[PDB]
Short mmCIF file of N, CA and C in Angstrom, two decimals:
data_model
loop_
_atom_site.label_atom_id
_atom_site.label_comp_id
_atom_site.label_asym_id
_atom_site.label_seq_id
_atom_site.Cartn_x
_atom_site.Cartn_y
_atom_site.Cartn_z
N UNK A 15 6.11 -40.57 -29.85
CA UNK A 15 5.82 -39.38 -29.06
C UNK A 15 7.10 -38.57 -28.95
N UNK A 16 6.91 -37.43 -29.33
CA UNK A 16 8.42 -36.06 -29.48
C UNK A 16 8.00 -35.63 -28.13
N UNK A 17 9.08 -34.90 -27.37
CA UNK A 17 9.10 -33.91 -26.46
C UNK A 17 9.40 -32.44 -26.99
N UNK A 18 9.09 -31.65 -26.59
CA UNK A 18 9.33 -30.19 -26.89
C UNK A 18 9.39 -29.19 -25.88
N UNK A 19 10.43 -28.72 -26.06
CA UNK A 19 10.95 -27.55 -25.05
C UNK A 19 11.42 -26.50 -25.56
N UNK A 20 10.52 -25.15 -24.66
CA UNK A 20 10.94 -24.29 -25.03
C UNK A 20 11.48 -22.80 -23.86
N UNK A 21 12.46 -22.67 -24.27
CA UNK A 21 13.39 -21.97 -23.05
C UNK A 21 13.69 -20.80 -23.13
N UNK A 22 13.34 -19.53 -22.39
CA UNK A 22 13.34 -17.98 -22.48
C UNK A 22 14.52 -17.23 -22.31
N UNK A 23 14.88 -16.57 -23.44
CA UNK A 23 15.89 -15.69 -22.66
C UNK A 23 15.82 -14.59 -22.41
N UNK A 24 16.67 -13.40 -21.82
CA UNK A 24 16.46 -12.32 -21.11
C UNK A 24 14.99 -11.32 -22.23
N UNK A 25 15.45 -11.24 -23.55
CA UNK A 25 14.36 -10.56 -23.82
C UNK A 25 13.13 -11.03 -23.50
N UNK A 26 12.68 -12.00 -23.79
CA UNK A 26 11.18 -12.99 -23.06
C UNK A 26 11.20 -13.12 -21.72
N UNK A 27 12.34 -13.30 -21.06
CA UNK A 27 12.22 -13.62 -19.59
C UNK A 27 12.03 -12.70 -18.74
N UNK A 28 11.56 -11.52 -18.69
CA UNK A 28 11.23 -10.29 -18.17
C UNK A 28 9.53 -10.21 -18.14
N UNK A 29 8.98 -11.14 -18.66
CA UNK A 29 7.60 -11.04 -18.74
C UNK A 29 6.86 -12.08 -18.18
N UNK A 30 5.74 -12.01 -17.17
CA UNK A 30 5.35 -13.21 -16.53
C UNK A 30 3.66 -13.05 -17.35
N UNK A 31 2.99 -13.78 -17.86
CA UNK A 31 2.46 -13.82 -19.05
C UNK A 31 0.99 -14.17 -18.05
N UNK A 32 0.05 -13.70 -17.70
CA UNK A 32 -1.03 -13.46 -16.87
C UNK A 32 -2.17 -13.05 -17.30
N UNK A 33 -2.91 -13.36 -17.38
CA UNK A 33 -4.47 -13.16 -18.40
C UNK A 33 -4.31 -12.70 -19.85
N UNK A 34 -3.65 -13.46 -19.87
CA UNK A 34 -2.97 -13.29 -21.64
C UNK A 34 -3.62 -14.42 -22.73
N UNK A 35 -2.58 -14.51 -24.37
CA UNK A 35 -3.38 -15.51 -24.64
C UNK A 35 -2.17 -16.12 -25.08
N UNK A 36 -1.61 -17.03 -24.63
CA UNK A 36 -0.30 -17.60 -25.62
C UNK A 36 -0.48 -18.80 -26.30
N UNK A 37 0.08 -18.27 -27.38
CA UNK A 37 -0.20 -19.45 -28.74
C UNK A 37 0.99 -19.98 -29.31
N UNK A 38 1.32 -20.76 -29.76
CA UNK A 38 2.36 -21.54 -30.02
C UNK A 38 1.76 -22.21 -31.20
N UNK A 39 2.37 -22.41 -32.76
CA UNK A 39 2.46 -22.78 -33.59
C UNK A 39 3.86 -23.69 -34.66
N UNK A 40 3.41 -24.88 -34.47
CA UNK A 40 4.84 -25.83 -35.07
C UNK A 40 4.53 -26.34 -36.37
N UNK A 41 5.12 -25.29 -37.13
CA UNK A 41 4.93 -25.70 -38.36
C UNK A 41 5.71 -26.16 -39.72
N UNK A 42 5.69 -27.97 -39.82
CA UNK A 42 5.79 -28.71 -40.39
C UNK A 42 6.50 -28.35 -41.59
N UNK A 43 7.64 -29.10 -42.46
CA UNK A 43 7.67 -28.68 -44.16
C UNK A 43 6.50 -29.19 -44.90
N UNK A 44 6.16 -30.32 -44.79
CA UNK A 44 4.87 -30.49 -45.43
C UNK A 44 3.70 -31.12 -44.48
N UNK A 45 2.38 -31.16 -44.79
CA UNK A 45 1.35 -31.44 -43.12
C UNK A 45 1.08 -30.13 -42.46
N UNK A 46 0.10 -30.44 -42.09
CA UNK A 46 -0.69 -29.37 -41.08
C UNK A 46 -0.10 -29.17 -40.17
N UNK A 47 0.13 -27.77 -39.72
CA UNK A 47 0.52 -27.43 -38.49
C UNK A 47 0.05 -27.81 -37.14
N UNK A 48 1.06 -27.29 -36.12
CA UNK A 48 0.25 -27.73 -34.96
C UNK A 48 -0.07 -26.09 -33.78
N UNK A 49 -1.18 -26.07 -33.92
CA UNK A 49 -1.60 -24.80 -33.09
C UNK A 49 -2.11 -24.27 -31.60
N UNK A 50 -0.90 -24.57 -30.87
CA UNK A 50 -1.30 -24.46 -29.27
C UNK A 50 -1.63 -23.32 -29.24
N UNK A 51 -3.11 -22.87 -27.74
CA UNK A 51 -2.95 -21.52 -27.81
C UNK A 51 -4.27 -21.71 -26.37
N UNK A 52 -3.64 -21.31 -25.32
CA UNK A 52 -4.25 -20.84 -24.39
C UNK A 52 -4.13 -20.03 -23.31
N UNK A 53 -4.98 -19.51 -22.49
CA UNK A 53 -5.24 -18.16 -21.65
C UNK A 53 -4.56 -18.87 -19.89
N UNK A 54 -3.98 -18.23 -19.47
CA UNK A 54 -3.33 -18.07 -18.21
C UNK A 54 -3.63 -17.07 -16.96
N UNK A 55 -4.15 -17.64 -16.44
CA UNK A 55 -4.34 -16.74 -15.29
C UNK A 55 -3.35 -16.09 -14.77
N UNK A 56 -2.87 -17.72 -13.48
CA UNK A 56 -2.20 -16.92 -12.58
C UNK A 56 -1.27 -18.56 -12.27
N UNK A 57 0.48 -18.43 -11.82
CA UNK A 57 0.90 -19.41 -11.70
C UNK A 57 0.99 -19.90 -10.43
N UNK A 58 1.22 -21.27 -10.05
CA UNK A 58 0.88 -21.45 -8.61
C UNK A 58 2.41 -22.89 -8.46
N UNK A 59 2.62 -23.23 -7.34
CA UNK A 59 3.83 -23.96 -6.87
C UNK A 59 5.45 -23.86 -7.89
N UNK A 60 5.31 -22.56 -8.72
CA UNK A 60 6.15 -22.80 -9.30
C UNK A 60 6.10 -23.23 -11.10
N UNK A 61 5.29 -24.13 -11.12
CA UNK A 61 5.11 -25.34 -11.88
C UNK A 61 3.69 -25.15 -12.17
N UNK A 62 3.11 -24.71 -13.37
CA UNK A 62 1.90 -24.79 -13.24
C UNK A 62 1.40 -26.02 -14.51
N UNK A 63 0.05 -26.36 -15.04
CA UNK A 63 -0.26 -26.87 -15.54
C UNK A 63 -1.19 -26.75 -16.70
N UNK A 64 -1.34 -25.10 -17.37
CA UNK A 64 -1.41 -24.89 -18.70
C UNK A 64 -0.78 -23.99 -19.24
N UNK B 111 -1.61 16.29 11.25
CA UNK B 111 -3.06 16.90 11.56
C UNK B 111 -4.04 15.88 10.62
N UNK B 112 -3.34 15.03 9.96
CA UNK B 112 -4.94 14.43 9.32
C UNK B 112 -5.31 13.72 9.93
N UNK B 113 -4.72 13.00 11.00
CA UNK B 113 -5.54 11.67 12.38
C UNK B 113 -6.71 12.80 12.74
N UNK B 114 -7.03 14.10 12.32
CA UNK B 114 -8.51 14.84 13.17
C UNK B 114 -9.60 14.40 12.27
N UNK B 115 -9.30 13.54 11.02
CA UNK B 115 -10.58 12.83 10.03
C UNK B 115 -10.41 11.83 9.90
N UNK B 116 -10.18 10.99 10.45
CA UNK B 116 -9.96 9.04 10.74
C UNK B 116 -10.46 8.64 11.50
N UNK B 117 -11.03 7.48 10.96
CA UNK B 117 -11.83 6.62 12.52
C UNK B 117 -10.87 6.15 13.17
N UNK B 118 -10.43 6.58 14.65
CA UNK B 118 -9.51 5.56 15.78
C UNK B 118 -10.50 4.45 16.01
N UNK B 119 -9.67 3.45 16.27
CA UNK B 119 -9.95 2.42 17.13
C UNK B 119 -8.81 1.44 18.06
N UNK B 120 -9.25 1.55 19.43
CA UNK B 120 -8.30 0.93 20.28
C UNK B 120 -8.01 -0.17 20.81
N UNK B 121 -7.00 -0.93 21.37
CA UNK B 121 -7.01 -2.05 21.68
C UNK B 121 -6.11 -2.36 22.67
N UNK B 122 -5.88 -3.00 23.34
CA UNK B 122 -4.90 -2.92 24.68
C UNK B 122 -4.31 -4.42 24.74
N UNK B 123 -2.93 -4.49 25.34
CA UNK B 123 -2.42 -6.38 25.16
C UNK B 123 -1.89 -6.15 26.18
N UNK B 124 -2.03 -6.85 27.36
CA UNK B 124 -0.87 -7.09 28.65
C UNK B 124 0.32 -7.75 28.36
N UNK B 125 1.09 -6.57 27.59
CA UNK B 125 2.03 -7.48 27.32
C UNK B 125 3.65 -7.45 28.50
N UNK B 126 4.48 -8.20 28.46
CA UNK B 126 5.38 -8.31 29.94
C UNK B 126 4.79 -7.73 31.18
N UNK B 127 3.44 -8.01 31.74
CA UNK B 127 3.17 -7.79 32.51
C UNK B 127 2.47 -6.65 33.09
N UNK B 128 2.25 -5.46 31.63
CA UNK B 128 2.18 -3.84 32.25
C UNK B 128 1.24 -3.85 31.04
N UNK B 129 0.39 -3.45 30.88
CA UNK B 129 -1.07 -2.74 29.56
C UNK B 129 0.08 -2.13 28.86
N UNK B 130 -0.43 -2.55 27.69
CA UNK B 130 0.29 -1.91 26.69
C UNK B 130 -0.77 -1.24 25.45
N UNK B 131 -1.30 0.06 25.40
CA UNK B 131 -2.88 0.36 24.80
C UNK B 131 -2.24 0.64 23.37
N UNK B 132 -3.11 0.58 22.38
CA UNK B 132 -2.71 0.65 21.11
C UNK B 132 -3.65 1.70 20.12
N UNK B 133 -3.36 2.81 19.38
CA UNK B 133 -4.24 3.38 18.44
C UNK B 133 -4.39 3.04 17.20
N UNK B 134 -5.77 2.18 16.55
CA UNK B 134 -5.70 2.25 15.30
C UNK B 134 -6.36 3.10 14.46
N UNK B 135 -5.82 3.76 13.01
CA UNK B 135 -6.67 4.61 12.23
C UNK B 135 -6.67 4.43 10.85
N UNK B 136 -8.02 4.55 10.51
CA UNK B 136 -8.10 4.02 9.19
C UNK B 136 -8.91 5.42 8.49
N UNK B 137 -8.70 5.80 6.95
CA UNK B 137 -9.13 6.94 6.81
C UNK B 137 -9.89 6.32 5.32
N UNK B 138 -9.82 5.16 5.38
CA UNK B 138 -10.87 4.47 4.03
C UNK B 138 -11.30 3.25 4.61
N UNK B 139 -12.24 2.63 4.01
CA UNK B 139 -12.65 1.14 4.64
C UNK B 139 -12.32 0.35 3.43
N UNK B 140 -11.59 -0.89 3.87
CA UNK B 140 -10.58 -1.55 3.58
C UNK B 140 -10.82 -2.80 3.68
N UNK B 141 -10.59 -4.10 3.86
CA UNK B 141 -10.78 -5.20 3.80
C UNK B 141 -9.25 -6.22 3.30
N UNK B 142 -8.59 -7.05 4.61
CA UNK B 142 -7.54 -7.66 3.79
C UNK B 142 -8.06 -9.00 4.34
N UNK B 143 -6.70 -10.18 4.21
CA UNK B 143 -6.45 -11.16 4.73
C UNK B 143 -5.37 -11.82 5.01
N UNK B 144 -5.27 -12.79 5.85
CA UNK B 144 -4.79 -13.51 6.59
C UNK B 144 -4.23 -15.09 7.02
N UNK B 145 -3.49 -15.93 6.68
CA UNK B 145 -3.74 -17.11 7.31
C UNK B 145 -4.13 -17.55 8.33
N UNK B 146 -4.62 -18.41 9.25
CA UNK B 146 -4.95 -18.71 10.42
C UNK B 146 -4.95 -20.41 10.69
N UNK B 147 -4.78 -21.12 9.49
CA UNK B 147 -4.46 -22.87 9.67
C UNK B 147 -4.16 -23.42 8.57
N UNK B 148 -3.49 -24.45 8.67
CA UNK B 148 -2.89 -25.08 7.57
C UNK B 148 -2.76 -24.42 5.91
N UNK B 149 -1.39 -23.42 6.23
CA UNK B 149 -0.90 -22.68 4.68
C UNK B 149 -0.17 -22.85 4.47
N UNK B 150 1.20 -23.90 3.69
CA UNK B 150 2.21 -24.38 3.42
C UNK B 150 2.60 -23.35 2.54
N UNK B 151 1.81 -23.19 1.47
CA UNK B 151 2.48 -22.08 0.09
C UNK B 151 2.01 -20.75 0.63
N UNK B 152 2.76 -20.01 0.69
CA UNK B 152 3.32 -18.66 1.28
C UNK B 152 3.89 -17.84 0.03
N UNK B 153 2.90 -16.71 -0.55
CA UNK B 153 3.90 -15.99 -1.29
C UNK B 153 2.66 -15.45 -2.58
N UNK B 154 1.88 -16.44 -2.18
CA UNK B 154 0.74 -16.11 -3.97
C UNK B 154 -1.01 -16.14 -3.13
N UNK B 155 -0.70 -16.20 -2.29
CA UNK B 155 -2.47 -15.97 -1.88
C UNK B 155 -3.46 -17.02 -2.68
N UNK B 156 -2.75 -18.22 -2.27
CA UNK B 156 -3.81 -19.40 -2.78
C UNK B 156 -3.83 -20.15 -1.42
N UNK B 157 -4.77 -20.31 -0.89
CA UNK B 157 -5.79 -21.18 0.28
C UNK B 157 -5.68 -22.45 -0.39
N UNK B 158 -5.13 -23.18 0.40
CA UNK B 158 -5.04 -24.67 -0.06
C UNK B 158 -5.86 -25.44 0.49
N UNK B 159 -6.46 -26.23 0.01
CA UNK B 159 -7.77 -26.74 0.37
C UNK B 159 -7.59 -27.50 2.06
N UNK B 160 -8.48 -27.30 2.56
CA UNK B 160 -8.53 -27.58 4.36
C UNK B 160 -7.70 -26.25 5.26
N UNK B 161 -7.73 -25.31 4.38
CA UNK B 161 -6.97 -24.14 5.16
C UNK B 161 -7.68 -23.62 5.79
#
């Protein structure tokens, strides 16, 4: 199991991303990619959970 | 001069001892909210369950 992190800087960090659709794609030299991609409401304690 | 097309409405609080009367006016109808019991998170308008 990998961990993955990914960390904003000022150009991205100006945007709080709210009924949107964010997708995330990790793609491999050889093998199928991997294609995250989901919709966000609204964030709550800080810390949210999609 | 535009309080002559607003609904007033009044209210009075004894407060230190002497009436203290109050005018309110609203010139649209409106609707907000409020806490009133158990709201720890303050800041995003999420009601936490038993609030």
């Amino acid at each position: 199991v990998i961990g993955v992190m990914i960390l904003f800087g000022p150009d991205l960090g100006s945007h709080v991303f709210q009924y949107q659709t964010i997708t995330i794609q990790i793609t491999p030299n050889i093998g199928s990619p991997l294609t995250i991609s989901e919709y966000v409401y609204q964030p709550e304690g800080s810390v949210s959970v999609i | 001069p535009f309080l002559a097309h607003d609904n007033m409405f009044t209210f009075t609080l004894n407060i230190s001892g002497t009436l203290v009367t109050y005018y309110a006016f609203v010139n649209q109808t409106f609707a907000f909210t409020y806490p009133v019991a158990g709201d720890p998170l303050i800041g995003s308008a999420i009601a936490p369950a038993g609030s």
